[PDB]
Design a protein around this ligand. Structure first.
Ligand SMILES: Cc1cc2nc3c(=O)[nH]c(=O)nc-3n(C[C@H](O)[C@H](O)[C@H](O)COP(=O)(O)O)c2cc1C
Ligand SMILES: CONC(=O)c1c(C)c(-c2ccc(-c3ccccc3F)cc2)nc2ccc(F)cc12
Ligand SMILES: O=C(O)c1cc(=O)[nH]c(=O)[nH]1
Length: 366
């Protein structure tokens, strides 16, 4: 491990947490990242980390999950941090404030966070203009193996969920390499019920029709992001719909509304989605199930509790083509990205894999 990794983990990040509430810290992180005020990414991506999936080259398989850069303010800084791809959002059609504060809670003893942001968003128009300002810069980044995802949400007061997602496809689809239909936020009432079979098919048909209506060069992949709290029936229904409609991929998983036995944090009973270490294995197991139900034919982006190369490789071996992290960055700071990549490269070599591609779904072939 580097000196930076230890300095961030043992001194800088604990000091920031002592000085700032979690939402203030989040806001400062976005500001610093937006300005490129980052420690040196002391890691060069090797060819063994390259993945080709979703119609794109990814220089490395480690992305920033949705919810860090909600409004597309820090995209270039996130690539500078060493992420192989960036997902912004969730973005709602109209601007909205989200839930009242406080709405983000640290669980230090669990290496977890609980959030109930409630889709605070600058809205599609603001985000569209922000992405248009750097659109050719992004085109060059994507061509150089650094794609951009856009995660779409719905407004609190909307009468027609499918129309909210459709508006997102029309507005931000032309600016994205992939879109995410986030039907798994625990913090918008009735949103997770869009994961049921009848509603999901109707919703996703409309989304895919809208996407197919974009000009070929501006046509993104469409992924569905799912909760970790689904029944077996829900998961078997989602897999069925994904295959029937030709959805391009799955993001597995969002935060959990469960509170696993063993949580120690004083704030464990706060309402919201739980992220970080306690979500890790529930998530890995969800990837495993979704990979099996889709016969390994549907790319999965694996997310939930990744904070080491081992965590990344477990999700890859379970079926993920790519991984994302968020909560790990909030505890360990920017050096965690290089750490995960360096550890993943070493473990791939140790386990006899030529690269990331060879490891995808390897547990299912044992
Ligand atoms: C503060 C916070 C805000 C989030 N906001 C979003 C969001 O707007 N849209 C979304 O799809 N996921 C959101 N997530 C979920 C993450 O993208 C990710 O699925 C989850 O946190 C699991 O990854 P992790 O354990 O590495 O954090 C958020 C997570 C946190 C902790
Ligand atoms: C568990 O306690 N953790 C937080 O309260 C927290 C932190 C410290 C951070 C953070 C701050 C700073 C950098 C950074 C430091 C140097 C250069 C660039 C950076 F982005 C990174 C991340 N971001 C968050 C985002 C969401 C959230 F819910 C909580 C946090
Ligand atoms: O905005 C939020 O509250 C939020 C959205 C989401 O999809 N996941 C999450 O944990 N929080």
């Amino acid at each position: 491990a580097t000196g930076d990794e230890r300095f961030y983990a043992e001194h800088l990040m604990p000091t920031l947490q002592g000085l700032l509430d979690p939402e203030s810290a989040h806001r400062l992180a976005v500001r610093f990242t937006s300005l490129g005020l980052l420690p040196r990414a002391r890691f060069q991506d090797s060819d063994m980390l390259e993945v080709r999936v979703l119609g794109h080259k990814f220089r490395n398989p480690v992305g920033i999950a949705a919810g860090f850069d909600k409004h597309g303010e820090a995209v270039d800084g996130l690539y500078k941090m060493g992420f192989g791809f960036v997902e912004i959002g969730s973005v709602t059609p109209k601007p909205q404030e989200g839930n009242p504060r406080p709405r983000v809670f640290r669980l230090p003893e669990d290496q977890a966070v609980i959030n109930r942001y409630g889709f605070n968003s600058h809205g599609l128009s603001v985000v569209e203009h922000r992405l248009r300002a750097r659109q050719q810069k992004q085109a060059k980044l994507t061509e150089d193996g650094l794609p951009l995802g856009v995660n779409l949400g719905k407004n609190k007061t909307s009468v027609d969920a499918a129309e909210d997602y459709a508006e997102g496809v029309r507005v931000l689809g032309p600016l994205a390499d992939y879109l995410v239909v986030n039907v798994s936020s625990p913090n918008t009432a009735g949103l997770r019920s869009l994961q049921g079979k009848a509603e999901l098919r109707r919703l996703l048909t409309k989304v895919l029709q809208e996407r197919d209506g974009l000009r070929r060069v501006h046509r993104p992949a469409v992924l569905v992001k799912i909760a970790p709290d689904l029944t077996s029936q829900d998961k078997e229904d989602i897999a069925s719909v994904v295959k029937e409609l030709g959805i391009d991929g799955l993001i597995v998983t969002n935060t959990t509304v469960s509170r696993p036995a063993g949580l120690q944090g004083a704030l464990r009973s706060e309402t919201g989605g739980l992220s970080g270490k306690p979500l890790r294995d529930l998530s890995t197991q969800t990837i495993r199930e979704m990979y099996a139900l889709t016969q390994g034919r549907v790319p999965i982006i694996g997310v939930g509790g990744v904070s080491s190369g081992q965590d990344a490789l477990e999700k890859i071996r379970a079926g993920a083509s790519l991984v994302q992290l968020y909560t790990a960055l909030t505890f360990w700071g920017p050096p965690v990205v290089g750490k995960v990549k360096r550890e993943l490269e070493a473990l791939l070599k140790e386990q006899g894999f030529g690269g990331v591609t060879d490891a995808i779904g390897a547990d299912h072939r044992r």
